[PDB]
Structure 1
Amino acid sequence: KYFMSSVRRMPLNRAKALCSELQGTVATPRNAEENRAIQNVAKDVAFLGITDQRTENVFEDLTGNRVRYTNWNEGEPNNVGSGENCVVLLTNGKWNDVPCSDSFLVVCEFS
């Protein structure tokens, strides 16, 4: 896997479109090593290819596969506000669930 970060912020739909344009997908860390690599390429908070849109509190990657490795920040995921179904990697490498409509950088993953 190769990981690349965008320079501009955008919501999830636009983030998925960007990675897909170059035939990749929004980055999904499968272990601590990949999590660190994605954190490093990202200069600020960035979207990961994980959501619980299909079923609340059931986090899966963009292909529908349930995720095993997770690295939630303390108190997360909390689905606050009117709901948070997308996931971002914080600048400390931990994860926070956020609204898919909000804008963040995007880290794309390619094989």
Structure 2
Amino acid sequence: GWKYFKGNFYYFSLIPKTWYSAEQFCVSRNSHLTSVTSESEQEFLYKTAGGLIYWIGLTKAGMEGDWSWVDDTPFNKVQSARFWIPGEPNDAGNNEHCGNIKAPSLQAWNDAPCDITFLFICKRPYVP
């Protein structure tokens, strides 16, 4: 049940997993938890999510706790600012080092604890 959008296939899971178990599942299917690199991709993702919470490829990297994409897409702090829910990321309990799609809006992302289980979204490139 992979959905096709702009050169990539996407898997919206039916089973919830911790952030890392999710990523491992994605990697087992030749994919990664999804990156988000445009307004149109964000829109495709939150709309397809239909108001449910899905882990995406957001996770912390380096000593500074900068956000990064697990698929190694460079994280663009400037261009991604409009994608977080107002007030996020907020590192609640100093233990929110992974990110999910939460609100059905362009401002969709929340940081949550990595060990919480949620549905998840894998992204796999199509290579002709």
TM-score normalised to structure 2 length: 0.78
Distance 2:49 2:18 in 1: 16
Of residues 63, 78, 82, the one that matches 2:94 is 82
Aligned to 1:18: 25
Distance 1:78 1:52 in 2: 13
Q: CA deviation at 1:24?
A: 0.7
Distance 1:98 1:55 in 2: 19
Of residues 59, 65, 72, the one that matches 2:67 is 59
SS at match of 2:92: coil
Counterpart code for 2:69 = D
- Equivalent positions of 1:1-111 (< 5 A) are 1-43=8-50, 44-68=52-76, 69-70=79-80, 71-93=83-105, 94-111=108-125
Equivalenced residues, count: 111
| Larger Rg over CA atoms | 2
Distance 1:110 1:65 in 2: 13
The superposition leaves residues 9-28 of structure 1 with CA deviations (integer Å, 9 ceiling, x where unpaired) of: 11011101111111011011
Higher helix content, 1 or 2: 2
The superposition leaves residues 30-76 of structure 1 with CA deviations (integer Å, 9 ceiling, x where unpaired) of: 11111111223324101110111433441111144441132110001
Q: Please identify, of 59-68 and 21-30, the stretch whose mean Cα deviation from structure 2 is larger.
A: 59-68
Question: Where in structure 2 are there 5+ consecutive unaligned residues?
Answer: 1-7
Counterpart code for 2:21 = R
Question: Where in structure 1 are there 5+ consecutive unaligned residues?
Answer: none
The verdict on how the C-alpha distance between 1:65 and 1:27 changes in structure 2, with shifts beyond 3 A counting, is: closer
Displacement over 6 Å in runs of 4+: none
TM-score normalised to structure 1 length: 0.89
Distance 2:11 2:93 in 1: 30
Q: CA RMSD in A?
A: 1.6
Identity %: 22
